[PDB]
Amino acid sequence: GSCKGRCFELQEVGPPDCRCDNLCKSYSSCCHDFDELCLKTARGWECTKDRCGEVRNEENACHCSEDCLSRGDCCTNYQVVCKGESHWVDDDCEEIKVPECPAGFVRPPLIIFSVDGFRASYMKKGSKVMPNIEKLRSCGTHAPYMRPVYPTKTFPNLYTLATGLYPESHGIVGNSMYDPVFDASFHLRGREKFNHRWWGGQPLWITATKQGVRAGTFFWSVSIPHERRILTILQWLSLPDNERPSVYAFYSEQPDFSGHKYGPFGPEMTNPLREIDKTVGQLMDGLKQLRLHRCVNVIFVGDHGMEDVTCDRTEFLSNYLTNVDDITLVPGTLGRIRAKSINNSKYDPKTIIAALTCKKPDQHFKPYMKQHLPKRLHYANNRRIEDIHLLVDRRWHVARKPLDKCFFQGDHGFDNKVNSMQTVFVGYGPTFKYRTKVPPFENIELYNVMCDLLGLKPAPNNGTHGSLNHLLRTNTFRPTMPDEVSRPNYPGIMYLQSEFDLGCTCDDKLEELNKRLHTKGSTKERHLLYGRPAVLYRTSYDILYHTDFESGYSEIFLMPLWTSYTISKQAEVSSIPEHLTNCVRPDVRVSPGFSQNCLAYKNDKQMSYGFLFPPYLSSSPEAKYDAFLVTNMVPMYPAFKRVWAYFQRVLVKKYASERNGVNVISGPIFDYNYDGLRDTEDEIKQYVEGSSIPVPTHYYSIITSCLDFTQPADKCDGPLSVSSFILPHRPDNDESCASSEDESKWVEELMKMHTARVRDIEHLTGLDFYRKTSRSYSEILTLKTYLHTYE
Numbered sequence: 001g002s003c004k005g006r007c008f009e010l011q012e013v014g015p016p017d018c019r020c021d022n023l024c025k026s027y028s029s030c031c032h033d034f035d036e037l038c039l040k041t042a043r044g045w046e047c048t049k050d051r052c053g054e055v056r057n058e059e060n061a062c063h064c065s066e067d068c069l070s071r072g073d074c075c076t077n078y079q080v081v082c083k084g085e086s087h088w089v090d091d092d093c094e095e096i097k098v099p100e101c102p103a104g105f106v107r108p109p110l111i112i113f114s115v116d117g118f119r120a121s122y123m124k125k126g127s128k129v130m131p132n133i134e135k136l137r138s139c140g141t142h143a144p145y146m147r148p149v150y151p152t153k154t155f156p157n158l159y160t161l162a163t164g165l166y167p168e169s170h171g172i173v174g175n176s177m178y179d180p181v182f183d184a185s186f187h188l189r190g191r192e193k194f195n196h197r198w199w200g201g202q203p204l205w206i207t208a209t210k211q212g213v214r215a216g217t218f219f220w221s222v223s224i225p226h227e228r229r230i231l232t233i234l235q236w237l238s239l240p241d242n243e244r245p246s247v248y249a250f251y252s253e254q255p256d257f258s259g260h261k262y263g264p265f266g267p268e269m270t271n272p273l274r275e276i277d278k279t280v281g282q283l284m285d286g287l288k289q290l291r292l293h294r295c296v297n298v299i300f301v302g303d304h305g306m307e308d309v310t311c312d313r314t315e316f317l318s319n320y321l322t323n324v325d326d327i328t329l330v331p332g333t334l335g336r337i338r339a340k341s342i343n344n345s346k347y348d349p350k351t352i353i354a355a356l357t358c359k360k361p362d363q364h365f366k367p368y369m370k371q372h373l374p375k376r377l378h379y380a381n382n383r384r385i386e387d388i389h390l391l392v393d394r395r396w397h398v399a400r401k402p403l404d405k406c407f408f409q410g411d412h413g414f415d416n417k418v419n420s421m422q423t424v425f426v427g428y429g430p431t432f433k434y435r436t437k438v439p440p441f442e443n444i445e446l447y448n449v450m451c452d453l454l455g456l457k458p459a460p461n462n463g464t465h466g467s468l469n470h471l472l473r474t475n476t477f478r479p480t481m482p483d484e485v486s487r488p489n490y491p492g493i494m495y496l497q498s499e500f501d502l503g504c505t506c507d508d509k510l511e512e513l514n515k516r517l518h519t520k521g522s523t524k525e526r527h528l529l530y531g532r533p534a535v536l537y538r539t540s541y542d543i544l545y546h547t548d549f550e551s552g553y554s555e556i557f558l559m560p561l562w563t564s565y566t567i568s569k570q571a572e573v574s575s576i577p578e579h580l581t582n583c584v585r586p587d588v589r590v591s592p593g594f595s596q597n598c599l600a601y602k603n604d605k606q607m608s609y610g611f612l613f614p615p616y617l618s619s620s621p622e623a624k625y626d627a628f629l630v631t632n633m634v635p636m637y638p639a640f641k642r643v644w645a646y647f648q649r650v651l652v653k654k655y656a657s658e659r660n661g662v663n664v665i666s667g668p669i670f671d672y673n674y675d676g677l678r679d680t681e682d683e684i685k686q687y688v689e690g691s692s693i694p695v696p697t698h699y700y701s702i703i704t705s706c707l708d709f710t711q712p713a714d715k716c717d718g719p720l721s722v723s724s725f726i727l728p729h730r731p732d733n734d735e736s737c738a739s740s741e742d743e744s745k746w747v748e749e750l751m752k753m754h755t756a757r758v759r760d761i762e763h764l765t766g767l768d769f770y771r772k773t774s775r776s777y778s779e780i781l782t783l784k785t786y787l788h789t790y791e
């Protein structure tokens, strides 16, 4: 019942026995003498020349005695002050070609140095403020920034780091949550947050444990001084082979604390950053003392950034809603609304959304049903995420009532593509590359890398395994392209016009002349630059060849899965000729029975149609007739045709003109259960009236060009440049508050908000892109995880 030679033990003492571990303070279950024995502060955390070869005084926080190395409780600067050795930071970068570990080390250890609220742009303050962190950054592998997950909050991002899952999957969807199944709230006070029922996925410490790799406790009670956390990690590294963990985590509440008080641009931010660097200095001096400075892989990583947010910049729901007493709000840098009571009949989600939609000119939040949020946020598929969500503008709060100098000048939680929310990544050690810069990447990718660093098999996660192989000197995972599951058909012109009764009309009116205009020819070479997309699910689809485009037409969904076409820089935009306005032509390659019918579209009062290949970019008047084929048409709300018509008529030409040509792949997405995955036939909930033509929830486009823009898109030798979108197929433009104005004022704004990774589309379509390129597969995986942020 005491903490004698037990302080910060890795042992798990069950209740009611008093504990001496990292978390005993947080549980409030420590032994009476924990505070005196384990929270020693006597003489601080640094050796001085006077202390060198001192008699061991056990009341001292750390020791400068001759026995301290064998005991493994020397102050981190003992060798420097007493044995005339240099600080790690004062040493030149020396490449770590192989891990230099003591015999008995079966793998290089990993230390995750996690810093709360560390904005990417803090790194610009340089070696003046942070010499130790700047040496790690410059000697090791670093990204300009790392993208957090939404919401850009502490627990959701820390747990994403540990699991490689989106919050919707791992279950920590906020710092605050209500679970209707549990009928309980997740809060930070007391024992609730320790209940395992909240925590999904498989965190790194459990992955390690389950594969026979010992993990040190990632969590630290705030009571434990940072200096003690570093010494405790270093103590654990000195344990014998059978006890010594391979994976460790350090956590700092800084620079988050000061960020909230002073804001991210305050000169007061310098002192927190100096102290963080000092703590990093103690770790690296500590590792060098143990001769583990060329053995251990160190990850310096933040959970999220920090924005300027004052209490003056608060939207109040009481200015929109006639009854705010009938709702519960999760307030601040995001809004989540649910009904307060059940007896209450006044609450109605549709009325609330209407009341919160474009009511004030400068409105600093936007209401969404969670299924209508940008798909890149992946924030819908969890019963803990309220149906009604408010996306708050950066620098702003949303609160229920006015009554709810400011105390705070900094906050986070905003859209994860916001610059101020971006955080840091640095990898240093034998397994990371030497003096290497890598492109920015998403925090969901780190779990796979940390598994690779530790020789662990990752649990299933939202990382793209291989996409970060370019961070590592050595890779124990080689990615393999997935096997195509469905082989395409190549149907010839076979059906007579008399066989078609689709109720479609066109102003049309040499059989083998029709055929040669719809043969392979050079179509694939011109319009499919990166090879045919692979269909990774069981289905029946047809490859259709045209002068201007190639399509994979689904005989199940009665529309293309993808439409591929190349627009040269020099391409000319034409109109839809008046005589072809309402033209839809039967496709004599495809059975009447596996075609859409124009009768469906007339009976559906709310539903019109568009085309995947745009008639506007036809190579000739002749070729334009191919664009009006029933196999090129898709269901579109008149409201959405405004967006799509502008994209096709104006923006594709624009992108082609800016990027020295563009390859475009467009098609439908079905995600009615908003799980971010391709719907099966059963899961599709809307069809065109009196038909089996399924209505897409979204329309995607993948726009590819040469990264070397001095080479045209169709003659690119090296890396590719991609931007993609997943546009919500909405029957209104309520999302766009300026949609009253010309399309030039709002459509591109809407598209930028729904920017997507190629991976996002692959999940939502069951397609695999970029299968025929001159690029390594690991390079292609990085390309597929890229997001164009427009920030």
Ligand SMILES: Cc1cc(C)cc(Nc2ncc3c(n2)CN([C@@H]2CCN(C(=O)c4cc5nn[nH]c5cc4F)[C@@H](C)C2)C3)c1
Residues within 6 Å of the ligand: 112, 114, 116, 154, 155, 158, 159, 161, 162, 175, 188, 218, 219, 220, 221, 249, 250, 251, 253, 256
């Ligand atoms: C690498 C890694 C992963 C994981 C999952 C774990 C750790 N370690 C760790 N150790 C101690 C803590 C944490 N992680 C996270 N903890 C916080 C304490 C309580 N808390 C807050 O009041 C809090 C609320 C905020 N709202 N806006 N900003 C906030 C900052 C805060 F600290 C939680 C959010 C989490 C302590 C380390």
Ligand SMILES: CC(C)CCC[C@@H](C)[C@H]1CC[C@H]2[C@@H]3[C@H](O)C=C4C[C@@H](O)CC[C@]4(C)[C@H]3CC[C@]12C
Residues within 6 Å of the ligand: 023, 026, 193, 194, 195, 196, 197, 199, 200, 201, 202, 203, 206, 219, 220, 221, 222
């Ligand atoms: C200072 C406070 C923030 C400390 C809070 C720590 C608390 C959230 C931690 C403590 C123990 C953690 C669980 C434990 O490691 C085991 C597992 C198994 C794993 O498969 C799922 C996660 C879970 C339940 C951990 C969740 C986080 C816990 C409760």
Ligand SMILES: *[C@@H]1O[C@H](CO)[C@@H](O)[C@H](O)[C@H]1NC(C)=O
Residues within 6 Å of the ligand: 165, 166, 169, 378, 460, 461, 462, 675, 676, 677, 763
């Ligand atoms: C994220 O990963 C989990 C586990 O593999 C999976 O259940 C989920 O479908 C993934 N989400 C997306 C959008 O890929």
Ligand SMILES: [Ca+2]
Residues within 6 Å of the ligand: 670, 671, 672, 673, 674, 675, 676, 677, 678, 679, 683
């Ligand atoms: Ca789905």
Ligand code: NA
Residues within 6 Å of the ligand: 601, 602, 603, 604, 605, 606, 607, 608
């Ligand atoms: Na109609």
Ligand code: NA
Residues within 6 Å of the ligand: 733, 734, 735, 736, 737, 738, 739, 740
């Ligand atoms: Na509008």
Ligand SMILES: [Zn+2]
Residues within 6 Å of the ligand: 116, 117, 153, 154, 256
């Ligand atoms: Zn935080």
Ligand SMILES: [Zn+2]
Residues within 6 Å of the ligand: 117, 154, 256, 257, 260, 412
């Ligand atoms: Zn914070």
